[PDB]
């Protein structure tokens, strides 16, 4: 007696599936050793399919790809408020597989209501190659039976028989349930009346019977409730696990069911022959590129045309003519492309020169062509060159891509690969047929447009973004489970901090030595075991920020699809699964820096007429490196970390190569090589190769650029290629083998190395130890192509900041204009840098942030209630008529139709109309002048010339000037942020008591005790209230009311609060403010001054130190108030501040 589960749910039924793919497959294997089979039938998706197939296939289990469809009562287009039912589907052959793929796709793309649903219509369309089973209690037929509508159930049975023929089976499952008794009894009748054959399943959701509770809390994590609710999501019993053929019999007795339901199980599983194109199989699906041009000829064409643009001084028309005579501009390239490979190798046998460039380009093209990848390159070059001609910024390159001269020639890549030491062989290894990966950075604003270009260009049914599936982190798993079990957040957080973090992410609960915490409480015994039972599980299905597939044939033929919440078409398979089916996968990355460099160029142009051509800038500009050397890395790509900033100031880089090496080495591990780099860079330590005297002739040319240190992987490859005589491609393989650290296969390369090492130069004593140096530095060796390409963006960023500091800042503002916190921050950066940031102004402002002379000026679009049509209207009216002469002139030129009263109000409050006088006066003047303006047109559209049609605008309706609080209040309402001032700076009473400023918090607190308490004072901005200084804001647990706050810091948690009037009531203390410049004979000058006026006010001292501002409260001395006047009667500044003690 055997049995094969055909209705089993995995971790891929994301809401209720608890069976991990691995331990499920071993449990099936350990139960049934003979011809084991398992069907993956997940709730309305095909996510697991590929990984399930490849895990089961390598375990000797026969996988069966299945689908528990949600089937709509009527049509999949229904958005009816019947519902939807279940249906078990299995693919018996590959056409079956494909049809599942289409159905699963269509369920999401056409039929998604609450769940992804399909039709009996579309089922009928895609029924070929499918076995169907009557389904669980939630399915149509059993459901009808429960409702006493036997007529509908038989009618539906007929409908399905008309669809699937003899591939329809009556599905019979039994848990203790009383509904199952009634359903199965009637199902049994149907099965015998139509001669249908019953198949036993039991709808698994966990692996073993013990997993029932683990699964029950899983549901409580989706249901987001306590273990005791009730009404919390629960299954009807604890039976939904992978049962032994014996346990199955206990539910389905022999003297009542017979052998048929069991025998049919094994028979179906046998007749389910589905194979995926993986590993042994796998075809490369390269999409076709339209072009009397070969795919290989045109890539050649574009390369020759490219070099001429790329190396103007050394690759010219004259040069090409010579090469052809050694056997229009475009006509020569077109000709050179045809030259065959038998012809080419008859010229070589007869510093980067013209001839050198040809050879490298010709070599790369040779390798590309032979491997069958010219089509791949064409596709990539096409969409990148589109994006350029279409106002979409493109990075100089990423990853190994920039190592190819071809890539660089045809504009895939934008850094000179042979100027820097970049290697083609690191990108494509000539000695291994493997598809290259070309990732590309775009402006993060425009990236989607590039994807859209591809979608249109290659076909809507052939292009989708790749899906991603977050794993459940060990820490997060513990917290989620602990919630459910009714455990207080805090003691749970202490349990989560026990788990080690070895590389960014926490360690599996499998390993995790303070486990004696389980021994104490039996509650936590479960929590910990349950959390490791739920560890491997999945969250939901996001889009990959970068993944894109261009398939050769319609996607739905091999890979199922989805559509995310923003309408993006998404793959149901992940990164790897897609790639393991041999599909062309690209990365289109959104990059901030690119988007920033665009606004910079735009603003620069408008500011001073300069056309910033980033790809034509000199790379040896002094003022750029001097700025990096000063450590002014504030907005500079790649090097903004606290530590990194310090390192750049230390290094004082002078050429781009310093940036490349600095970025490569600054990370845990190589970090240590930087001091050495610096002393050698400063010209205060010789660079010596004495340990390899015979290898020096090879080592110097490679490692000189980087002061003897092997920093780059490319540097190693070259060393091994020159010393050992290795092919540069083989040196690549070597670096892979250094990285794998294969037990003793490393000793094979050793002997091979020394062989070629002797044969070349080194006496082999050096060789063995030189290989020791390689294996040492190959652990932390960096990919130079990636480093170099990125470094260029850093430079470009810094260069702008060096030469155009104001526009730089205005671009930083522009780029993050929708973030009130960042905008506030950037303003305070600019203001404390010499650059004034001004409120908008109807006469000078452009639409966005603008630089006038040497100031940054807010745009009109920045004003809160003003539409976008209105902002442009104002500007366009100002361009056809002159600058606005007065408020009246403004109101008659722009009717209320366009700039409504609400809009006008904000515009005043912003300061956009400040050129017309007092604001309070302007606000009041509005409605009278609106009446006036409306009345002018009445006379105007009733004849009346110009004197008869205008009793020219009355004076400004008078009112008292606004106070600072109310004026600043209006600004914020109108601009989101305060410009020129902050409400808190009006009453410095709070400033003085505050133990800190918002900015200084992190810096001040870190070094103190464990989880300290602190007092902060600022403004309130929430109906989790937000507190704000003139220095920043904070989350802390109504508006325009100042508060002092006592709170705990780890995030900030409030414990006590006092109002402005409360603080100004608590007894006051004298605070003197002393500079660092104070004599010995003062600290007893000041000391005696206070000694002579006793009382009971504590004395505080603000000591503005060299780095930081200390707060020394005095000692014994207690002044008696009068001392303030007599103390300000000398070179000392003083204040009567509220006493810090009370709070």
- Total site size for Cl ion, rule CB under 5 A: 1
Residues with Cβ within 8 Å of residue 309, at least 6 apart in sequence: none
Contact string 158-197 vs Mg ion (x = CB under 5 A): --x-------------------------------------
Out of Mg ion, Zn ion, Cl ion, none, what residue 1030 binds, judged by CB under 5 to 8 A for its kind, is none
* Cβ distance to Zn ion smaller for residue 203 or 211: 203
Please give the radius of gyration of the chain, using alpha carbons only, rounded to the nearest integer: 37
- Total site size for Mg ion, rule CB under 5 A: 4
* Number of neighbouring beta carbons within 10 Å of residue 987: 14
Contact string 420-439 vs Mg ion (x = CB under 5 A): -----------------x-x
Q: Is 587 in the site for Mg ion (CB under 5 A)?
A: yes
* Cβ distance to Mg ion smaller for residue 437 or 517: 437
Helix (H/G/I), strand (E/B), else coil: 1060: helix
| Contact assessment for residue 23 and residue 225, using Cβ atoms and an 8 Å cutoff | no
Helix (H/G/I), strand (E/B), else coil: 1027: strand
Handedness of CA 1036, 1038, 1039, 1045 (dihedral sign): negative
Contact string 221-260 vs Mg ion (x = CB under 5 A): ----------------------------------------
Which residues is 85 bridged to in the sheet? 71
Give the CB-nearest residue to Cl ion.
708
* Cβ distance to Zn ion smaller for residue 206 or 726: 206
Distance, in Å, from the CA atom of 976 to the CA atom of 910, rounded to the nearest integer, reads: 10
Helix (H/G/I), strand (E/B), else coil: 139: strand
| Contact assessment for residue 119 and residue 47, using Cβ atoms and an 8 Å cutoff | no
| Contact assessment for residue 59 and residue 21, using Cβ atoms and an 8 Å cutoff | no
The minimum distance between CB 708 and Cl ion, in angstroms, equals 5
* Cβ distance to Zn ion smaller for residue 41 or 722: 41
Breaks in the chain (C to N over 2.5 Å), named by the residue before each, are 81, 291, 327, 350, 512, 1023, 1037, 1050, 1083
CA angle (533, 539, 545) in 5-degree steps? 140
* Cβ distance to Mg ion smaller for residue 171 or 587: 587
Helix segments in 59-203, DSSP class H: 94-109, 120-125, 140-146, 150-164, 178-193
* Cβ distance to Cl ion smaller for residue 304 or 666: 666
Q: How far is CA 498 from CA 493, 508, 1012, in A?
A: 9, 12, 21
Contact string 649-688 vs Cl ion (x = CB under 5 A): ----------------------------------------
Quote the strand ranges of 444-523, DSSP E.
Answer: 463-471, 501-503, 505-506
| Binding region for Cl ion (CB under 5 A) out of 126-134, 701-709, 825-833, 1073-1081 | 701-709
Contact string 955-974 vs Zn ion (x = CB under 5 A): --------------------
Out of Zn ion, Mg ion, Cl ion, none, what residue 416 binds, judged by CB under 5 to 8 A for its kind, is none
The minimum distance between CB 1006 and Mg ion, in angstroms, equals 39
Q: Is 119 in the site for Mg ion (CB under 5 A)?
A: no
Give the CB-nearest residue to Mg ion.
587
* Cβ distance to Mg ion smaller for residue 526 or 785: 785
| Binding region for Cl ion (CB under 5 A) out of 17-25, 536-544, 708-716, 945-953 | 708-716
The minimum distance between CB 71 and Mg ion, in angstroms, equals 6
Distance, in Å, from the CA atom of 27 to the CA atom of 149, rounded to the nearest integer, reads: 40
Q: Is 42 in the site for Zn ion (CB under 5 A)?
A: no
* Number of neighbouring beta carbons within 10 Å of residue 876: 10
* Cβ distance to Mg ion smaller for residue 51 or 160: 160
* Cβ distance to Cl ion smaller for residue 649 or 769: 769
* Cβ distance to Mg ion smaller for residue 398 or 1068: 398
Distance, in Å, from the CA atom of 957 to the CA atom of 805, rounded to the nearest integer, reads: 42
Distance, in Å, from the CA atom of 1017 to the CA atom of 1001, rounded to the nearest integer, reads: 12
Distance, in Å, from the CA atom of 996 to the CA atom of 1034, rounded to the nearest integer, reads: 13
Out of Mg ion, Zn ion, Cl ion, none, what residue 16 binds, judged by CB under 5 to 8 A for its kind, is Zn ion
The minimum distance between CB 252 and Zn ion, in angstroms, equals 18
| Contacts of range 551-554, beta carbons closer than 8 Å, 24 or more positions apart | 551/285, 551/287, 551/462, 551/463, 551/583, 551/584, 552/285, 552/286, 552/287, 552/288, 552/462, 552/584, 553/285, 553/462, 554/459, 554/461, 554/462
* Cβ distance to Cl ion smaller for residue 166 or 672: 672
Q: Which single residue is written with the structure tokens 């099965």?
A: 191
| Binding region for Mg ion (CB under 5 A) out of 423-431, 580-588, 632-640, 699-707 | 580-588
Distance, in Å, from the CA atom of 123 to the CA atom of 129, rounded to the nearest integer, reads: 11
The minimum distance between CB 684 and Cl ion, in angstroms, equals 16
Closest CA to 133 of 96, 72, 100, 86: 86
- Total site size for Zn ion, rule CB under 5 A: 3
* Cβ distance to Cl ion smaller for residue 708 or 846: 708
| Binding region for Zn ion (CB under 5 A) out of 64-72, 495-503, 577-585, 867-875 | 64-72
| Contact assessment for residue 874 and residue 899, using Cβ atoms and an 8 Å cutoff | yes
| Binding region for Mg ion (CB under 5 A) out of 153-161, 341-349, 923-931, 1073-1081 | 153-161
Which one of residues 51, 160, 203, 807 is an interface residue with Zn ion (CB under 5 A)?
Answer: 203
Burial per residue of 36-55, b for 16 or more beta-carbon CB atoms within 10 angstroms, e otherwise: bbbbbbbbbbbbbbbbbbbb
* Cβ distance to Mg ion smaller for residue 121 or 1003: 121
* Cβ distance to Mg ion smaller for residue 85 or 780: 85
Out of Cl ion, Mg ion, Zn ion, none, what residue 999 binds, judged by CB under 5 to 8 A for its kind, is none
The minimum distance between CB 90 and Zn ion, in angstroms, equals 13
Q: Is 154 in the site for Mg ion (CB under 5 A)?
A: no
Interstrand relation of 439-443 and 584-591 (parallel, antiparallel or unpaired):
parallel
Restricting to residues 437-466, name those near Mg ion by CB under 5 A. 437, 439
| Binding region for Cl ion (CB under 5 A) out of 700-708, 953-961, 1059-1067, 1135-1143 | 700-708
Distance, in Å, from the CA atom of 393 to the CA atom of 193, rounded to the nearest integer, reads: 69
Q: Is 16 in the site for Zn ion (CB under 5 A)?
A: yes
Distance, in Å, from the CA atom of 1117 to the CA atom of 214, rounded to the nearest integer, reads: 66
Residues with Cβ within 8 Å of residue 247, at least 6 apart in sequence: none
Restricting to residues 32-61, name those near Mg ion by CB under 5 A. none
For Cl ion, the binding residues (CB under 5 A) are: 708
For Mg ion, the binding residues (CB under 5 A) are: 160, 437, 439, 587
For Zn ion, the binding residues (CB under 5 A) are: 16, 68, 203
């Amino acid at each position: 007696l055997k049995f094969a589960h055909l209705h089993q749910h995995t971790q891929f039924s994301l809401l209720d599936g608890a069976a991990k793919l691995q331990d499920l497959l071993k449990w099936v294997k350990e139960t049934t050793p003979e011809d084991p089979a398992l069907a993956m039938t997940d709730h309305g998706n095909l996510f697991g399919a590929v990984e399930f197939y490849k895990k089961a296939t390598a375990m000797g289990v026969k996988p069966i790809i299945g689908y528990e469809a949600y089937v709509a009562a009527e049509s999949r287009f229904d958005r009816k408020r019947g519902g939807y039912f279940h249906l078990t589907l299995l693919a018996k052959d590959f056409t079956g597989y494909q049809n599942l793929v289409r159905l699963a796709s269509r369920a999401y793309l056409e039929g998604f209501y609450e769940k992804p649903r399909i039709d009996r219509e579309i089922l009928r369309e895609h029924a070929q190659g499918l076995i169907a089973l009557s389904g669980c209690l939630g399915a149509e037929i059993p459901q009808f039976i429960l409702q006493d509508r036997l007529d509908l159930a038989e009618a539906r049975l007929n409908e399905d028989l008309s669809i699937f023929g003899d591939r329809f089976f009556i599905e019979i499952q039994n848990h203790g349930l009383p509904e199952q008794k009634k359903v199965n009894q009637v199902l049994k009748e149907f099965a015998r009346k139509y001669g249908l054959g019953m198949v036993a399943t039991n709808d698994g959701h966990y692996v073993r019977k013990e997993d029932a509770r683990a699964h029950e809390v899983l549901l409580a994590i989706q249901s987001k409730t306590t273990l005791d609710d009730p009404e919390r999501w629960r299954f009807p019993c604890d039976e939904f696990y992978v049962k032994t053929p014996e346990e199955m019999r206990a539910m389905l007795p022999e003297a009542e069911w017979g052998d048929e339901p069991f025998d049919n199980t094994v028979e179906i599983a046998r007749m389910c022959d589905v194979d995926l194109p993986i590993g042994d199989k796998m075809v490369y699906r390269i999409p076709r590129f339209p072009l009397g041009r070969t795919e290989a000829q045109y890539l050649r064409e574009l390369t020759f045309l490219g070099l001429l643009r790329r190396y103007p001084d050394r690759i010219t028309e004259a040069f090409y003519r010579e090469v052809l005579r050694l056997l229009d501009e475009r006509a020569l390239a077109e000709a050179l492309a045809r030259v065959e490979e038998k012809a080419w190798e008859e010229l070589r046998k007869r510093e980067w020169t013209a001839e050198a460039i040809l050879h490298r380009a010709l070599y790369e093209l040779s390798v590309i062509e032979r491997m069958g990848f010219p089509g791949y390159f064409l596709i990539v070059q096409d969409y990148i060159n589109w994006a350029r001609g279409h106002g979409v910024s493109v990075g100089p390159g990423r990853g190994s891509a920039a190592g190819s001269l071809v890539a660089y020639a045809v504009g895939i890549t934008n850094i000179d690969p042979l100027r820097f030491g970049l290697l083609f062989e690191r990108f494509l290894n000539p000695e291994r047929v493997s598809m290259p990966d070309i990732d590309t950075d775009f402006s993060d604003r425009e990236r989607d447009r590039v994807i859209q270009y591809v979608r249109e260009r290659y076909g809507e049914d052939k292009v989708a973004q790749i899906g991603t599936f977050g794993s459940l982190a060990s820490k997060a798993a513990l917290k989620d489970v602990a919630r459910v079990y009714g455990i207080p957040h805090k003691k749970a957080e202490e349990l989560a901090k026990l788990i080690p973090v070895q590389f960014g992410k926490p360690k599996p609960l499998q390993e995790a030595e303070l486990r004696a915490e389980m021994e104490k409480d039996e509650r936590i015994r479960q929590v910990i075991e349950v959390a490791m039972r739920l560890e491997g599980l999945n969250r939901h299905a996001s889009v990959h920020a970068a993944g894109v597939v261009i398939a050769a044939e319609p996607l739905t033929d091999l890979v199922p699809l989805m559509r995310d919440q923003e309408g993006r078409p998404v793959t149901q398979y992940d990164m790897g699964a897609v790639e393991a089916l041999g599909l062309l996968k690209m990365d289109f990355l959104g990059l901030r820096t690119l988007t920033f460099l665009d606004e910079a160029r735009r603003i620069v142009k408008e500011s001073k007429g300069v056309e910033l051509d980033y790809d034509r800038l000199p790379l040896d500009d002094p003022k750029t490196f001097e700025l990096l050397s000063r450590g002014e890395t504030k907005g500079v790509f790649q090097l903004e970390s606290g530590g990194m900033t310090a390192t750049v100031r230390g290094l004082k880089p002078r050429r781009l190569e310093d940036i490349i090496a600095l970025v490569s080495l600054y990370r845990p591990g190589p970090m240590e090589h930087i001091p050495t780099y610096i002393r050698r860079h400063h010209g205060q330590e010789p660079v010596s190769y004495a340990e390899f005297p015979h290898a020096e002739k090879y080592l110097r040319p490679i490692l000189d650029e980087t002061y003897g240190i092997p920093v780059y992987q490319e540097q190693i490859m070259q060393i091994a290629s020159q010393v050992a005589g290795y092919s540069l491609g083989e040196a690549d393989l070597l670096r892979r083998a250094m990285g794998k650290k294969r037990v003793e296969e490393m000793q094979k390369h050793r002997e091979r190395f020394v062989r070629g090492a002797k044969e070349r130069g080194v006496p082999e004593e050096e060789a063995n130890r030189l290989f020791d140096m390689l294996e040492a530095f190959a652990n932390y060796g960096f990919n130079k192509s990636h480093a170099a390409a990125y470094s260029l963006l850093s430079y470009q960023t810094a260069y702008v900041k060096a030469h155009y500091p104001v526009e730089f800042m205005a671009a930083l503002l522009s780029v993050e204009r929708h973030d009130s916190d960042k905008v506030a921050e950037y303003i305070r950066d600019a203001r404390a840098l010499g650059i004034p940031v001004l409120p908008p102004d109807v006469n000078r402002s452009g639409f966005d942030f603008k630089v006038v002379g040497e100031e940054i000026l807010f745009g009109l679009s920045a004003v809160k209630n003003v539409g976008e049509m209105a902002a442009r209207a104002i500007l366009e009216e100002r361009e056809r008529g002159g600058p606005f002469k007065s408020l009246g002139d403004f109101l008659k030129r722009l009717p209320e139709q366009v700039v409504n009263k609400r809009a006008l109000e904000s515009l005043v409050k912003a300061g956009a109309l400040d050129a017309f006088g007092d604001r309070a006066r302007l606000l009041a003047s509005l409605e009278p002048l609106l009446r006036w303006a409306a009345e002018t047109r009445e006379r105007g559209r009733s004849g009346l010339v110009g004197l008869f049609a205008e009793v020219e605008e009355p004076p400004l309706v008078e009112a008292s000037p606004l106070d600072e609080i109310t004026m600043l209040r209006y600004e914020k309402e109108a601009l989101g942020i305060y410009v020129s001032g902050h409400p808190v700076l009006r009453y410095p009473g709070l400033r003085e008591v505050a133990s800190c400023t918002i900015e200084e918090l992190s810096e001040f607190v870190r070094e103190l005790p464990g989880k300290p308490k602190v007092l902060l004072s600022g403004m309130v901005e929430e109906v989790r209230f937000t507190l704000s200084d003139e220095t920043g804001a904070l989350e802390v647990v109504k508006e325009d009311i100042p508060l002092l706050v006592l709170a705990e810091v780890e995030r900030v948690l409030a414990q006590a609060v006092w109002t402005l009037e409360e603080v100004l009531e608590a007894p006051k203390a004298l605070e003197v403010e002393v500079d660092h410049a104070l004599l010995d004979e003062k600290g007893a000058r000041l000391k005696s001054l206070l000694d002579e006026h006793p009382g009971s006010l504590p004395v505080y001292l603000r000591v503005l130190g060299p780095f930081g501002e200390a707060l020394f409260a005095l000692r014994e001395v207690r002044v008696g108030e009068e001392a303030l006047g007599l103390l300000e009667a000398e070179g000392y500044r003083a204040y009567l501040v509220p006493d810090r003690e009370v709070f």
